[PDB]
Every structure is written in C-alpha cells, then in structure tokens.
C-alpha cells in the first residue's frame, strides 16, 4: 500500500482542479488584444525609436 | 579614445585585466585531459578510481602521470534523465567504460529475467551510438576476471549467450566477450575502442589509459594540419 | 668573343633554344599556378570559419606562391626576345627582388609546415601544439622580415647594361667573384632538405612504432608526407647540381675562355623553371588533397 | 488490487469532466477573433553589440532590472557580469563547479545565483566592503541537477531540479521553506509572475503546472505538448504564458480559460525550442531554436515576423530587457549578441 | 575590518629625500587604485599622485612632477611614495586613499590615518565662496560649490564628490557623482546640482555633523579640491 497514498493524493488534486472556474476563450482573447493595443506605443521593438534615444546606437 | 572620462578609462583598464586573467585561465584549462567514467555501480568503477589515484551530484578525481594532468568525472550519482545533461560532456578526450566480467550469470534485483551483462550491453550501445559522442574514443575495462576464471567452470558461458558454441577455455570466453562488446559500435571509422583486462594490476591500468589518450591526442593533432 | 664585364669578367650567352622551350612551359606554369593559388586564397579568406596555428602558415605559403606567380608574365617577354628587357630599369631590379624573396619565403614556409607536423606527431604533449593565433602571426611577420632582409640587397644593383645592342636583366650569370646570391641559392636548399628529411623520417618511424598503421587515414597521411619530400627534391635538385657543375668548371678551367659554358648555361636556365613548377605543384598537395578543406 | 483500480477509474472520469468543461468553455479561437487586426510589419533587427570572453559553451543569461547589466554562465567555470552599453566586463566570478546550467540576477542587483550538475544553488554577494565577490550561501537540498532559479527578493529564491521537484528557499537560514511535488518528470524551466505570487514550471512529462507560492499547492495543470518542455515565460499581463518544447512548436495558454489558445509552428521547422521570451507589450514572441537562429513570432496572429541569424551554433538562451529596448542571445559558439 | 596604516615622515632637512609607505589589510589590495592626498597645516586637501590597479597608469600633480615617484608592492599589500628634493612647502599630512572603478562603484570611499611630514626652514577651479556657516541643531543648512568648467559629461554622469572631515579625523566620503549616498552615510544628507552650480543639503542637523566640507571634481586627471566650508555650532 505504498503508492495508495500518492494515488489518493492525485485523486484529491484532480478534484481540486475539477472545481476551478472557467471563462470563455473570447473574453481572454479580447483581454490579450486590449493589453497589446494599450501598450503598443511603449514597445521599442515593434516601433523602432530614433537613434537620438537609442542606448545601443 | 579621447571621448571617455577618467572613470570610463579606468573601467576599460579593469576590463582588460579581467580579459587577461580569463585568457590565462583558459590556457591552463586547455593544457589538461578530460575523461568521463561510465558503467554500472558495482561494475568496478570504484576500484578503477582507486587504481588511478595512487555527497551526491558529480564526483571529480584528479591525478597526474608523466607530466600529464587528468581529471575524471563520475556521473553515477545522477539518477535523472541522461539525455538532458549528456550533451554537457561533448568534447571530452575519451570515455572510460567499466564492465564486470563476473556478471554473466548474475541478474538485476529489479528484474530477474534482465541479467546484468545484457543491461551493460544496452548501456554501452546507447552511449557508443550517441549523437554527441560520434568522434570520441572509448576505453573499455573488464574487471572481475579472476572471478570469471573461477566461475567459468561451474557456470557455463552459454547461460548468458544461448548461441555460444565454444569451449569453456578462459581466454576463449574472454575473447568472445570482448568481440561481443566491440561489435556494438556502428561508426568503426570515426570511433576506436580500446579493451583491456585488469583485475588487480598495479600501474598497468594508468599506463594503458595514458597510451590510449596519447593515441587519441595524436589523431586530434593531425586534424588541425588537415592531413587526417 | 662571349666575354663580358658587367662589374667583373663574366661570360654571357644568347641562345635560340630558350625562345622555343621556356615560353610554353612557363605559360602553363603561370596559368595553373595562378588558378590554384587564387582559388585557395579566396577559399581561405571567405569559406574558412576558424583559423588555427597551421592554417596561418599554409596561408602564408599560398600568398608567397601567389606573389611569385603573379610577377612572372614579365620575364616571358625577356625569354621570347632572347635576352631583351624593354620594360625599363626599376622593373628589373624590383622583380629580381620579388623572385629572390618569394622563392626563399616559399621554402621557409614548407620548412615551417614540416616542423609543425613533426612536433604534432612526435611530441603530442607540447606547448607548441597549442599556441594562440597571435603568436603564429608574429612568427610569420618575423619570418617575412628574415626573407626580406636576406633579399633586400637585390634592389641596389647595376641593371639593364648594354652588351651587344640589348640590355641584360639577370642575377644568374656565370661570373667569378662568388656573389652572395649563389651562396643563398645553395643554402636555401641544403639545410631545408635536411630538416625536411629528418622531420619526415621521424614521423613515419613514430607512426610505425606506435602501431597506427592499420588505420587507413594514417596510411594516407604517410603517403602525403612522402609526396612532399619527393616533390621538393625533384623540384630543387637539378638547379643545384648544375650550379655545382658550373662552379667546378669555373674553378678548374677558369673564366679566361668562354664558349665552354654554352651547354651548362642552357641547362641551368632550362631547369630553373622547375622551381616555378614547384609553386604550381604544391597548392594541390597542401590544400586540395586534404580530408578537410 | 481493487481500490487502486477504482481510484484510477475515478481519476479517469475526473479528467473526462475537466475535458468536457474545457470544450464547453471554448466558444471561439483566438485566431478567429484576431484576423481583423492589422499585422505587424517585417522585423529587421540588427546586431549592435557582441560580447566575447567566454571560452566554452554559454548555457544561461539574465538581464538586470536596470536594463544595462547582465550576467552570463558558461561551461568554462566562469560567471561574467557585462556592461552592455560599453561591452566592459564588470566582474568575473570563478565557480567551484564548472558544470553550471542556470544563473539568475537579483532584482535589487546585490546578489547573483548559479547552479548545475552539483545539485547546489550558490549565492554570491556582489557588494562587499572588500573588492571581491564571495559566496554568501549554498543550498544543498535537491537530489538532482538544478535547471532553473529565480530570485523573489534578497532573501527568497525558487529553484527547479532534476529530482522532479521545485523548492522555495530562505537564503538567511539556508533551508527549504516549501516543496512542490506534483510533476512526474525532470523540471526544466520556471517563470515568475510579475506580481510574484504564482509561478509556472515545465517538465519532461510534457506538462506545465501553475503553483501557489504561499499555499504550496498546484493550482492548474496544462497539457497539449508532445515532448519535453524546455522553456516557459509569462505574458507581460500575467494572465497567460508560453511554452517551448522539443516537438518544434510553441504554445500559448490562458490561466482563466485553462486551455491552449494558439500554436506557433512551421512545417519546415523540425528542431526543438531552447528558450522563449516576450516583448514589453506582449505582441512579439521570441524563441530560440536548435537550427542556430531565433524566430520572431506575432503572438496574436501566429505568423513569423522576423529572423535573428548570426550565431554559428545552438541558441541556448535569450532575454529581453525590462524596458523592451534590446534583446540578448547566448549560444554554444561562446558568444553573446545584443539585438535592436 | 578594512584598515590603511601609513608610516614614515618626521623631520627632514631641505633638499633631502624620504620614502613613505602605507600598509593595507582587510581588503583585496590588488583590485584597487590608490591615491596620495595632501593636507597643509591650515589649508585644504590637495591631490598628489595616483597609481592604477596593475600599475599600468600613473599620474602626478604638476607641483610634484619629477620629484616624487609612486609604486606599489602587491604581494606585500604596501604602497610607496619616494620624495626627492624636498621643499619648505612640502610640509603637510599625507593621506592614502583607495579607489575602485567600474559601473556603479564608489571611488575615494576609504581614507587612511595620515602621517605628518615636516621640513625645516587648464585645471578645473572649484570654488566654495562661503567659508563659515554657524548652525544650530535641528536646522536645515545648505553648502554650495561651483565649478569653472561644466562637470556634466556626454554619458550623463556629473563627476562631483562631497567629503566631510571631522576635527581630528580623516576625511569621509558622503556623496559621489552628485547624487549617490555612501553606504555608511545617514539619509539626512542630499546632493543636487546642474553642471556648474552644486549644493549639499543637511536636514535634521545633529551634533556629529560639525566639520569641514569639501567638494571634488573627478572629470579631469588633475583632481582639484574646493576650499573647505567649516560648520561651527
Ligand atoms: C633568369 C632570371 C630572370 C630572367 C628574366 C628576368 C629576370 C630574371 O630568373 C631568376 C630568378 O627568378 O631567381 C633570376 C634570373 O636572372
């Protein structure tokens, strides 16, 4: 009965991830799109900066 | 040039000194021979280490012989997956493999059907025909040979090898074992295998290792010129 | 009748066989050497990734051979017109310095390669076998300086001197004053031959005593080591033999009577193209005929 | 052997209902919504700096929070701290064990960490009243090689190991505060959330798990990969993370939806991913590969938007500064490059 | 503990020679550059000479060029200063200072306890116009220093240093690069400035802040000190 304890622990863990709530995929997609849009101007990689303010000029 | 302040120039000088120290350490490291030690736990790795040198993780052993510095690395303590860290030892001079000759009749504790000799053969096949050691020579050691002589009479060699058809002569059995092990490698042109029979030899093991390492180093030196 | 005084008594000959024999073989040597050396050069400068201590010496050999080859379309016009130099005065001494420098540089860079292979085979554990690329460069610079210093005195000499309506551009004439150039000619062959022979014999002796002969690549290395010595001897022996014959004739008969050197002069000038052919032959022995390239 | 079979069947039905709930909550696909947005242009990043001095393969690097200093670890037994603006070397730390696999830089900048096949995480104090860097602490709990380590603060660090476990350490006492034991394979990488309350780990069992730092329990489990997971990183928001594995694909997972969102693969890419990272806004996904080059992906449209080439060997690590100004890559060819 | 101990000095006849030595302990001597700083019996600090780590770089003041030589013995952790043709104006307290240079380091952080030398019988100008500011505990006091040349550099660093010398004590570093506090300095000190005009602000004044405050520039090799500003209770 060495592995019965770990099997029961696995069953208990699966019961814990069973009751976790879920939301729609569309809402998460919208949230990621909104985050990407809001900080678009603050990304120096997809919007290259002038050599005046580039530390690696 | 002249566009740097005083502290910038001092930092540059510090960087140059660090570079010099790094180059010196690199040269000192490059003057030394790296060896990887493999085999079963009871196959005779410990006695080989003791002969050369006359808690968990990686065990390093350093010994010198005829002005050459060796350092062996033992990876027997790592029970994790071998493919995730075996690429770290790419570039070692040679691999030292230890096999116990008296294992032909014993079997593993986990599986009674799985005998120790076939497990050693499987490990040797996996290590030799590996994508990372395609150009690394292997030094093979067969350790328990007096016990092999004692046990070859009572227990016939046919137990481990059903297709064995030779006599119970000791040297014939040893030759059969060596031929069986030496036939696992599929390169046969980029890799060479050096096999030796040691039970309690004094300084013969170190001399054999030194000769094999010199032979590998000669062929590595012939790679730089290009005529090899 | 054939006597001449460039700075001392010196027989000088104009022959017809030279115009027949030298232009064709020299043109073939020029084209083949140019092709091989240039190809190896732009493979070295572009296709290679990491430079080691031996490829630096090999590249120096390549550049020396290329420099020697590129500077001999001009002595084709000195051979087709018997002995006639219409290119001026500076373009004579300047190219004499070129040739006498590049030949010695090539010989030195074969000797360096031979010594390097000797040290890597016979003494596998040695500090020379592991040297950074910064020491090979300084050794190369020092060797180039040595050859330039030994050749530099060819730039100050009395060139195009009229003899019979033509001007002469030749540092190899049958004189009797023991010019240092002939001593350099003998010395650049004697010692390097001994060094190469010793470093070659020891390599095969060690490779046979240590029993690597069963390996195929060891046999290939052995034969490509023998090829180097064979090429060197067949390319540099006849010129020295004929020069020794000429010196012996000068010592015995004397320089008072010319016309006895008619055959030996032609033989020396015909065989002197073997040195040029060596620069054509060695790029494929050293560069192309290797497992890695 | 009866109750074990019943428990296994119960677990099978539990997984079945989890799958059914995930299918029910998958109304649309992130690719379906995103198609209307304008795509990013071709990304043309050029090398700006090259850092030399390592004499062996580079295995790990980590940026500092100031976005100027960075530390790199190599098999030559040295730990080097670089000034990326001037390419100056600030420190060179000789390690007791040269078989290093990971390195981390403390957010405060006072400490650096490293570890590897010795099963020991070492902490070095960079600011001493003397002029040298000396060992501050050594952690010796794990029974396998250390694959990753990340500082929570000056006194807390979390490590992953080859003994299928992750642990949270107290540096002052050198003791294991918490242990995480959900995985069934070698844990290869971990990533810390921006708020430093959760972290994710990827293991060789082709699964990722979300851990609670305080409760010491596994919150969620993520599947979908087919081979060992080698790299992991949170989305900058903190509600998503990306994984790279040996099956030559990258995937994005949502914490709230408990399922995959996008797959980043190409038919002509057959080598495994070694490292992965996000840009400051999360729009670009940078991944290092075994085929000697890094690929820049559009994280919202799963279309390749650029390539970083210039390494002669395998790209083993990469990271983006906290201000998003530069990207650094380390490779087995013993060179570090800064891209912009 | 970090310790710098100087030895030598005494009474020297004019035109004579004498060697001073400083022994270091408690820190990695070979990783630091070293300076010699001078202190007239009533005047302010005056830089003399500097030697870098590895002895690669050596600099001297104009007034001591040729007469003085500086050397270090790394295995013995000792610094040397050999003086020849001594003059009557060479009488001063000779301090030994350690400095390390890398990104984010603090140069001039530790000063030794100098030894008295007695003999019988272009450059950036740093100005501290105020020479005495009488103060009371609990009051906020500002000390200002101005430079002839701008200390701001193209890399964004302003090379200004603030020092404090308590009565009967070696100078102590407070502010480096115009804004950064030293490790042991309390938070009540603050530094600010822009290129040419600089100030040091002390808030919640204590009784341990009585002394002379010096400003130093580290932009150009002839390092110069401003005349100190004394605070009296
Ligand atoms: C016969 C000769 C020559 C011939 C034509 C023009 C110049 C030089 O070639 C050699 C030489 O390369 O060493 C020396 C010469 O006198």
Q: Give the Å distances, CA to CA, from D33 to D11, D29, D196, D258, D300.
A: 35, 7, 31, 19, 10
C167: helix, coil or strand?
strand
**Tokens 């570079």, residue located:** B19
Q: What are phi and psi of D76, to 5 degrees?
A: -70, 5
CB D200 within 8 A of CB D148: no
Dist CA C291 CA E60 (whole Å) = 60
CA quadruple E216, E218, E220, E226: dihedral, nearest 10: 0
Dist CA C75 CA C63 (whole Å) = 20
Dist CA E68 CA B46 (whole Å) = 64
Contacts 24+ apart (CB under 8 A), C142-150: C143/C60, C143/C105, C143/C108, C143/C109, C143/C112, C144/C60, C144/C105, C146/C108, C147/C101, C147/C104, C147/C105, C147/C108, C148/C101, C150/C104, C150/C184
Dist CA E90 CA C81 (whole Å) = 85
- Name which CATH class applies to E3-119: mainly beta
Burial class from Cβ neighbours inside 10 Å (0-12, 13-18, 19+) for residue E233 reads exposed
Resolution in A: 2.7
Asked if D73 is an interface residue toward chain B (Cβ–Cβ < 8 A), one would say no
Instruction: Tell me the two tokens of residue B191.
Output: 């890799």
Dist CA A48 CA A52 (whole Å) = 12
Chain B contacts of C291, Cβ < 8 Å?
226-228
* Sheet bearing D78-83, strands edge to edge: D58-63, D69-74, D78-83, D88-94
- What are the sequence ranges of the domains in chain D? 2-339
Chains B and E form CB pairs within 8 A to the count of 36
User: In this structure, are strands E160-165 and E141-147 parallel, antiparallel, or unpaired?
Assistant: unpaired
Q: What are phi and psi of D302, to 5 degrees?
A: 55, 40
Dist CA C292 CA B134 (whole Å) = 17
D339 min Cα distance to partner chain E (Å): 21
Q: Which residues contact D92 (CB under 8 A, 6 or more apart)?
A: B18, B21, B22, D78, D79, D80, D81
Dist CA B180 CA B192 (whole Å) = 15
E38 min Cα distance to partner chain D (Å): 25
For A4-56, CATH number? 4.10.260.10
Q: Which residues contact B188 (CB under 8 A, 6 or more apart)?
A: none
Secondary element (H or E) of residue C4? strand C3-5
- What are the sequence ranges of the domains in chain A? 4-56
Q: CA angle, C240 as apex, C239 and C243 as ends, to 5°?
A: 85
Q: Give the Å distances, CA to CA, from D15 to A3, A19, B192, D21, D287.
A: 20, 12, 52, 10, 31
C170 lines ligand 1 (CB under 6 A): yes
Over chain E, what HEC string results? CCEEEEECCEEECCCCCEEEEEEEECCCHHHCEEEEEEECCCCCEEEEEEECHHHCCEEECHHHCCCEEEEEECCCCEEEEEECCCCHHHCEEEEEEEECCCCCCCCCCEECECEEEEECCCCCCEECCCCECCCCCCCCEEEEEEECCCCECCCCCECEEEEEECCCCCCEEEEECCCEECCCCCCCEEEEEECCEEEEEECCCCCCCCCEEEEEECCCCCCCECCCEECCC
| D2-339 is a CATH 2.130.10.10 domain | yes
Q: What are phi and psi of C19, to 5 degrees?
A: -60, -30
Contacts 24+ apart (CB under 8 A), C210-216: C210/B215, C210/B218, C212/B215, C212/B218, C212/B219
Instruction: Tell me the two tokens of residue A13.
Output: 């863990």
Output the CA A5–ligand 1 centroid distance in Å: 96
Q: Whose CA is nearest to atom 16 of ligand 1?
A: C170
Asked if D290 is an interface residue toward chain B (Cβ–Cβ < 8 A), one would say no
Are the beta carbons of D83 and E31 separated by less than 8 Å? no
Dist CA C128 CA C122 (whole Å) = 12
**Tokens 């900048």, residue located:** D109
Dist CA A8 CA B112 (whole Å) = 31
Output the CA C72–ligand 1 centroid distance in Å: 9
CATH superfamily assigned to domain C3-288 = Rhodopsin 7-helix transmembrane proteins (1.20.1070.10)
List for chain C the helix, strand, coil content (%; round to 5): 70, 5, 25
Instruction: Tell me the two tokens of residue B172.
Output: 């014939």
CB A45 within 8 A of CB D46: no
Instruction: Please tell me which chains touch B, using 3 or more CB pairs under 8 Å as the contact test.
Output: C, D, E
Dist CA D75 CA B87 (whole Å) = 12
Dist CA D91 CA D110 (whole Å) = 13
Dist CA C256 CA C262 (whole Å) = 14
In the DSSP assignment, the letter for residue C44 is: I
Output the CA C158–ligand 1 centroid distance in Å: 15
Chain B contacts of E221, Cβ < 8 Å?
6
- Domains E3-119 and E126-227 in one fold: yes
C99 lines ligand 1 (CB under 6 A): yes
Dist CA B224 CA D7 (whole Å) = 63
* Residues followed by a gap in chain A, C→N > 2.5 Å: none
Are the beta carbons of D130 and E103 separated by less than 8 Å? no
| E126-227 is a CATH 3.40.630.10 domain | no
E13 min Cα distance to partner chain D (Å): 39
CB D142 within 8 A of CB D167: yes
Asked if D246 is an interface residue toward chain B (Cβ–Cβ < 8 A), one would say no
Distance from the first to the final alpha carbon of chain C: 57
C175: helix, coil or strand?
strand
Dist CA E92 CA E107 (whole Å) = 23
Q: CA angle, D55 as apex, D53 and D61 as ends, to 5°?
A: 70
In the DSSP assignment, the letter for residue C171 is: S
- Name which CATH class applies to B33-215: alpha beta
Interface-testing mutation among B9, B18, B62, with chain D (most D C-beta atoms within 10 A): B18
Asked if D228 is an interface residue toward chain B (Cβ–Cβ < 8 A), one would say yes
Chain E residues within 8 Å of chain D (Cβ atoms): 2, 26-28, 31-32, 100, 102-103
CB E215 within 8 A of CB E145: yes
Minimal Cβ distance to D324: which of A20, A35, A43: A43
Dist CA B180 CA C6 (whole Å) = 81
Are the beta carbons of E28 and D130 separated by less than 8 Å? yes
Nearest CA in chain B to C211: B215
- What are the sequence ranges of the domains in chain C? 3-288
Instruction: Tell me the two tokens of residue D205.
Output: 């069992």
Dist CA B104 CA B85 (whole Å) = 30
- What are the sequence ranges of the domains in chain E? 3-119, 126-227
User: In this structure, are strands E10-12 and E115-119 parallel, antiparallel, or unpaired?
Assistant: parallel
C104: helix, coil or strand?
helix
Q: Which residues contact C235 (CB under 8 A, 6 or more apart)?
A: C274, C275, C277, C278, C281
Over chain D, what HEC string results? CCHHHHHHHHHHHHHHHHHHHHHHCCCCCHHHHHCCCCCCCCECCCEEEEECCCCCCEEEEEECCCCCEEEEEECCCEEEEEECCCCEEEEEEECCCCCEEEEEECCCCCEEEEEECCCCEEEEECCCCCCCCEEEEEECCCCCCEEEEEECCCCEEEEEECCCCEEEEECCCCEEEEEECCCCCCEEEEEECCCCCEEEEEECCCEEEEEECCCCCEEEEECCCCCCEEEEEECCCCCEEEEEECCCCEEEEECCCCEEEEEECCCCCCCCEEEEEECCCCCEEEEEECCCCEEEEECCCCCEEEEECCCCCCEEEEEECCCCCCEEEEECCCCEEEEC
In the DSSP assignment, the letter for residue C290 is: S
Q: How far is CA C8 from the centre of its chain?
A: 28
Instruction: Tell me the two tokens of residue C283.
Output: 């790029």
User: In this structure, are strands E197-202 and E212-217 parallel, antiparallel, or unpaired?
Assistant: unpaired
CA quadruple C115, C116, C119, C122: dihedral, nearest 10: -80
Q: Is the dihedral of CA D203, D207, D210, D215 positive or negative?
A: negative
Chain C contacts of B224, Cβ < 8 Å?
52-54, 120
């Amino acid at each position: 009965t060495a592995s019965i304890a770990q099997a029961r622990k696995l069953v208990e863990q699966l019961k814990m991830e069973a009751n976790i709530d879920r939301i729609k995929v569309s809402k998460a997609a919208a949230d990621l799109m909104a985050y990407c849009e809001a900080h678009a101007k603050e990304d120096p990689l997809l919007t290259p900066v002038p050599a005046s303010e580039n530390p690696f000029r | 040039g002249c566009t740097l302040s005083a502290e910038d120039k001092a930092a540059v000088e510090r960087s140059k000194m660090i570079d010099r120290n790094l180059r010196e350490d690199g040269e000192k490291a490059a003057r030394e021979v790296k060896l990887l030690l493999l085999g079963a736990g009871e196959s005779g790795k410990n006695t080989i280490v003791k002969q050369m040198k006359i808690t968990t993780g990686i065990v390093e052993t350093h010994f010198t012989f005829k002005d050459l510095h060796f350092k062996m690395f033992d990876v027997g303590a790592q029970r994790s997956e071998r493919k995730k860290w075996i690429h770290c030892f790419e570039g070692v001079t040679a691999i030292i493999f230890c096999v116990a000759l008296s294992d032909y009749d014993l079997v593993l504790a986990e599986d009674e059907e799985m005998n120790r000799m076939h497990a050693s053969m499987k490990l040797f096949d996996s290590i030799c025909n590996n994508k990372w050691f395609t150009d690394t020579s292997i030094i093979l050691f067969l350790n328990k040979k007096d016990l092999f002589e004692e046990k070859i009479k009572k227990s016939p060699l046919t137990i481990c090898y059903p297709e064995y058809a030779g006599s119970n002569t000791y040297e014939e059995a040893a030759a059969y074992i060596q031929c069986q092990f030496e036939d696992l490698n599929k390169r046969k042109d980029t890799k060479e295998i050096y096999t030796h029979f040691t039970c309690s030899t004094d300084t013969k093991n170190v001399q054999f290792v030194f000769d094999a390492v010199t032979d590998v180093i000669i062929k590595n030196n012939l790679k730089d010129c290009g005529l090899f | 009748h054939f006597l001449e005084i460039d700075k001392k008594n010196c027989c000088v000959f104009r022959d017809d066989f030279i115009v027949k024999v030298l232009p064709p073989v020299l043109g073939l040597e020029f084209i083949f050497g140019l092709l091989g050396n240039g190809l190896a050069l732009w493979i070295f400068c572009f296709h290679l990734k990491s430079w080691k201590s031996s490829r630096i010496f090999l590249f120096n050999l390549a550049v020396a051979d290329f420099l020697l080859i590129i500077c001999l379309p001009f002595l084709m016009d000195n051979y087709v017109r018997r002995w006639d130099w219409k290119f001026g005065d500076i373009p004579c001494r300047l190219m004499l310095f070129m040739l006498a420098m590049n030949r010695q540089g090539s010989i030195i860079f074969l000797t360096v390669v031979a010594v390097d292979r000797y040290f890597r085979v016979v003494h596998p554990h040695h500090a020379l076998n592991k040297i950074s690329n910064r020491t090979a460069a300084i050794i190369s610079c020092l060797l180039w300086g040595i050859t330039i210093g030994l050749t530099v005195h060819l730039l100050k000499k009395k060139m195009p001197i009229q003899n019979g309506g033509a001007n002469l551009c030749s540092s190899f004439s049958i004189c009797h004053t023991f010019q240092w150039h002939e001593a350099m000619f003998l010395l650049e062959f004697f010692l390097p031959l001994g060094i190469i022979l010793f470093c070659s014999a020891r390599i095969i002796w060690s490779l046979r005593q240590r029993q690597m002969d069963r390996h195929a690549k060891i046999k290939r290395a052995i034969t490509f080591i023998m090829v180097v010595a064979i090429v060197f001897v067949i390319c540099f022996l006849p010129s020295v033999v004929v020069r020794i014959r000429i010196f012996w004739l000068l010592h015995t008969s004397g320089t008072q009577n010319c016309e006895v050197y008619r055959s030996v002069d032609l033989a020396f000038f015909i065989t002197l193209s073997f040195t040029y052919m060596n620069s054509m032959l060695d790029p494929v022995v050293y560069y192309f005929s290797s497992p890695s390239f | 052997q009866s109750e074990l079979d019943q428990l296994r069947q119960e677990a099978e039905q539990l997984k079945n209902q989890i799958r059914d709930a995930r299918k029910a909550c998958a109304d649309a696909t992130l690719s379906q919504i995103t198609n209307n947005i304008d795509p990013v242009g071709r990304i043309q990043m050029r090398t700006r700096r090259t850092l030399r001095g390592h004499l062996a393969k580079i295995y790990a690097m980590h940026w500092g929070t100031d976005s100027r200093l960075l530390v790199s670890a190599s098999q030559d037994g040295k730990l080097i701290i670089w000034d990326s603006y001037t390419t100056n070397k600030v420190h060179a730390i000789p390690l007791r064990s040269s078989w290093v696999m990971t390195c981390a830089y403390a957010p405060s900048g006072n400490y650096v960490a490293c570890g590897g096949l010795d099963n020991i995480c070492s902490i070095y104090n960079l600011k001493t009243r003397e002029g040298n860097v000396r060992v501050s602490r050594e952690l010796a709990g794990h029974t396998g090689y250390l694959s990753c380590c990340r500082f929570l603060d000056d006194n807390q660090i979390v490590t992953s190991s080859g003994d299928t476990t992750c642990a949270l350490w107290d540096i002052e006492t050198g003791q294991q505060t918490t242990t995480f034991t959900g995985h069934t394979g070698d844990v290869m990488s971990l990533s810390l959330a921006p708020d430093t309350r959760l972290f994710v780990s990827g293991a060789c069992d082709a699964s990722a798990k979300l851990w609670d730092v305080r409760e010491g329990m596994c919150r969620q489990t993520f599947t979908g990969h087919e081979s060992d997971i080698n790299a992991i990183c949170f989305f900058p928001n903190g509600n998503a993370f990306a994984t790279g594995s040996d099956d030559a694909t990258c995937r994005l997972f949502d914490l709230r939806a408990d399922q995959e969102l996008m797959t980043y693969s190409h038919d002509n890419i057959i080598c495994g991913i070694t490292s992965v990272s996000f840009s400051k806004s999360g729009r670009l996904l940078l991944a290092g590969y075994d085929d000697f080059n890094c690929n820049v992906w559009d994280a919202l449209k799963a279309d390749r938007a650029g390539v970083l080439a210039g390494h002669d060997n395998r790209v083993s690590c990469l990271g983006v500064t906290d201000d998003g100004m530069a990207v650094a890559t380390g490779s087995w060819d013993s060179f570090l490059k800064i891209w912009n | 503990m970090v310790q710098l101990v100087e030895s030598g000095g005494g009474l020297v006849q004019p035109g004579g020679s004498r060697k001073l030595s400083c022994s270091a302990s408690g820190f990695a001597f070979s990783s630091f550059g070293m300076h010699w700083v001078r202190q007239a019996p009533e005047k302010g600090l005056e830089w003399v000479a500097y030697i870098s780590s590895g002895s690669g770089t050596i600099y001297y003041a104009d007034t001591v060029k040729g007469r003085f030589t500086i050397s270090r013995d790394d295995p013995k952790n000792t610094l040397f200063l050999q003086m020849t043709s001594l003059r009557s104006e060479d009488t001063a307290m000779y301090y030994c200072v350690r400095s390390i240079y890398y990104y984010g380091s603090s140069p001039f952080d530790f000063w030794g306890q100098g030894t008295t030398l007695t003999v019988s019988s272009s450059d950036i100008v740093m100005t501290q116009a105020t020479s005495s500011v009488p103060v009371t505990p609990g009051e906020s006091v500002s000390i200002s220093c101005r430079s002839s040349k701008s200390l701001l550099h193209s890399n964004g660093n302003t090379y200004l240093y603030w020092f404090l010398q308590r009565p009967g004590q070696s100078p102590q570093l407070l502010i480096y690069r115009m804004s950064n506090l030293a490790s042991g300095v309390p938070d009540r000190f603050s530094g600010s400035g822009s290129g040419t005009a600089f100030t040091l602000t002390i808030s919640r004044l204590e009784a341990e802040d009585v002394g002379v405050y010096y400003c130093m520039q580290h932009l150009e090799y002839p390092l110069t000190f401003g005349a100190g500003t004394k605070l009296e209770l």
